[PDB]
Ligand SMILES: [Cl-]
Ligand SMILES: [Cl-]
Ligand SMILES: [Cl-]
Ligand SMILES: [Cl-]
């Protein structure tokens with residue numbers, strides 16, 4: 001599924017991500033924009049053989065099982081394919097664990113490089129939330 005901006009913001013809020021670990025909804029929408037362009041089915045292989053999955057490009061090196069990332073963990077206790085669903089529940093639950101791991105949203109390099117410090121409220125501007 002390719003979400004619209006306000007549609008994703010609403011879904012994220014519905015799933016408790018709004019201000020989770022102190023990160024406002026716009027931060028999460030911005031991260032999703034630059035990780036996946038709002039596409040739940042986005043996958044991208046990393047140079048090291050892991051793959052990033054879904055709306056928030058969650059990495060198989062630590063967070064989900066894809067069966068082809070030797071030496072890796074599955075800390076979200078989910079198959080990586082669950083992170084590709086139209087329903088964002090699995091991605092949100094796993095993102096909550098990632099953002100709690102110590103470095104906040106800096107875990108998402110694209111958030112650090114493209115969202116951090118910016119006017120992230122623009123991402124929820126106009127949305128009926
Ligand atoms: Cl947009
Ligand atoms: Cl915001
Ligand atoms: Cl594996
Ligand atoms: Cl959803």
Ligand SMILES: [Cl-]
Pocket residue numbers: 021022103104105
């Ligand atoms: Cl933080």
